[PDB]
């Protein structure tokens, strides 16, 4: 009795809502991102005795930063040369090197240069993947995507790379983290904590698996949707890194062709004898990791065997491991890696896998726009840490399930990293009762 209304300010309660998120930058940069925004130092506090539901499928900031990655790529690629006048008819014979069938463009053509008087004859070096065959005589050839879109050369000195990015909350909005180790991608966390901004998430572009990423806390974690057994993509997050060594062994000769102030870059000549580019895997780490992954996956599926095959059909972005290293894009044969089976009941030896490289790459989510990678001189070596897998499943039948790699959609790769965070809106104006009146 004798209760009256009172109001309170600074109330600790929140709702869940969409918002626009702020981003951070780095001191050193390539030089919209190169000097902006700010580069703060974050801190973290633990929300004791707080339980909150999380869901890595429904959360919105993944799509937000997907749009941000697209917009940054477009703004970076906007002040660049358009390669339209290269769409003329190519006459290729391709017999200059010791072996020709590997690369198969070595292609003469006419180009206007610096006078607009009359086109002059030039020749360059190209890969047969980027070359398509015109009708009639086989020696006639065309560029691959010019029947569909315009092709832009990337300027080499503004090259974009996985710079770590921190996502800052705006004022009045809080970010929740769920520091629990065995979080399953959905459900209630009882280990809630808050930050001002996230850690250094890198824009990693890869297919069939992901790399240069974070690592799990306990053992290997499996994240998947649970609306139905019919799933698009299942994420596997490793607790232990495996090392990959990639190499393009040959040196290349960059040559420049002048088109106004632009200067088109092409390949002149490969130095020395031709060797095919390849990657290397520690065999014991790979097969032990596969055994651990399969014997952990059979928790979900009770009595059926587990068997792996490589993917079938589609473009090269899903049949092969594709990624970027340096300035060069690699497509790696993964047939030998995924040939295992298991019944349902430290660095010895090395698997080598063959690769192919191509210069004209479509946008990694979309067709109707393509970009031309510039040639990179010299031999290229790379070392990376693979942190997880993106898998899909077949139907199969009784006694046997089947899992094969996939993951052509680039958004699920960033969904594999931003599973922790969630954005909430603060509602600090909770009312209350009290045993007190107001002065009259």
């Amino acid at each position, epitope marked *: 009795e004798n209760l009256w209304v009172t109001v309170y300010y600074g109330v600790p309660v929140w709702k869940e809502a969409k918002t626009t998120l702020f981003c951070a930058s780095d001191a050193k940069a390539y030089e919209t991102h190169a000097c902006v925004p700010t580069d703060p130092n974050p801190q973290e506090m633990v929300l004791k005795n707080v339980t909150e539901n999380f869901n890595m499928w429904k959360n919105d900031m993944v799509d937000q930063m997907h749009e941000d990655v697209i917009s940054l790529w477009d703004q970076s690629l906007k002040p660049c040369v358009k390669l339209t006048p290269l769409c003329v008819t190519l006459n290729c014979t391709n017999a200059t090197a010791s072996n020709s069938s590997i690369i198969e463009g070595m292609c003469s053509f006419n180009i206007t240069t610096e006078l607009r008087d009359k086109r002059e004859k030039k020749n360059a070096l190209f890969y047969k993947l980027d070359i398509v065959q015109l009708d009639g005589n086989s020696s006639q050839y065309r560029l691959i995507n010019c029947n569909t879109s315009v092709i832009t050369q990337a300027c080499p000195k503004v090259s974009f790379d996985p710079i770590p990015i921190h996502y800052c909350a705006p004022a009045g909005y809080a970010i929740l983290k769920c520091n629990n180790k065995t979080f399953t991608g959905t459900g209630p966390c009882n280990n809630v904590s808050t930050v001002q901004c996230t850690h250094g998430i890198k824009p990693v572009v890869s297919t069939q698996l992901l790399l240069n990423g974070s690592l799990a806390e306990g053992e290997i974690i499996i994240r998947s949707e649970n609306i139905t057994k019919n799933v698009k993509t299942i994420i596997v997050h490793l607790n232990e890194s495996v090392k990959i060594e990639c190499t393009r062994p040959n040196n290349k000769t960059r040559t420049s062709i002048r088109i106004p102030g632009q200067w088109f870059y092409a390949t002149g000549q490969v130095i020395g004898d031709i060797r095919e580019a390849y990657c290397n895997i520690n065999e014991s780490k790979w097969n032990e990791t596969l055994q651990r992954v399969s014997k952990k996956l059979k928790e979900y599926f009770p009595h059926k065997n587990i068997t792996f095959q490589p993917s079938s059909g589609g473009d090269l972005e899903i049949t092969t491991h594709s990624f970027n290293c340096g300035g060069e894009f690699f497509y790696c044969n993964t047939s030998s890696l995924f040939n295992r089976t298991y019944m349902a009941n430290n660095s010895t030896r090395t698997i080598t896998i063959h690769c192919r490289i191509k210069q004209i790459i479509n946008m990694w989510q979309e067709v109707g726009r393509a970009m031309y990678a510039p040639p990179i001189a010299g031999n290229i070596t790379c070392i990376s840490n693979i942190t997880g897998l993106l898998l899909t499943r077949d139907y199969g039948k009784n006694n046997t399930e089947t899992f094969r790699p996939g993951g052509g*959609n680039m958004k699920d790769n960033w969904r594999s990293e931003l599973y922790k965070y969630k954005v909430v809106k603060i509602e600090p104006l909770g009312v209350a009762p009290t045993r007190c009146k107001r002065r009259v």
Partner: nanobody
Amino acid sequence: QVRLAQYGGGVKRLGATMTLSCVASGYTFNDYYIHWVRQAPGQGFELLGYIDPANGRPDYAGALRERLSFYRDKSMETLYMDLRSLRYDDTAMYYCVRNVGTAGSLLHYDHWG
């Protein structure tokens, strides 16, 4: 608004390889999966397989992995079946269907061609 036109069909000779084509018209072509369903006379429907038009990823039924083939062209947004080695039991009404799906899972079918 959305339409799924189909071309090819009629009579095909025994033992040959046959091709069906579909054209989608009024929606974002990369967003929705496409399934291929058929109905023999005197029998219920059954699924042959499905295709992702974005990356060209197929998936096939267990009994027909060797005879089927799906692919697509993204610029003319056109989808193609190839079926090899036709047999007499393949007499059927064939449809493409668009599939509605979430970010992680697939759901009911909306439209039939």
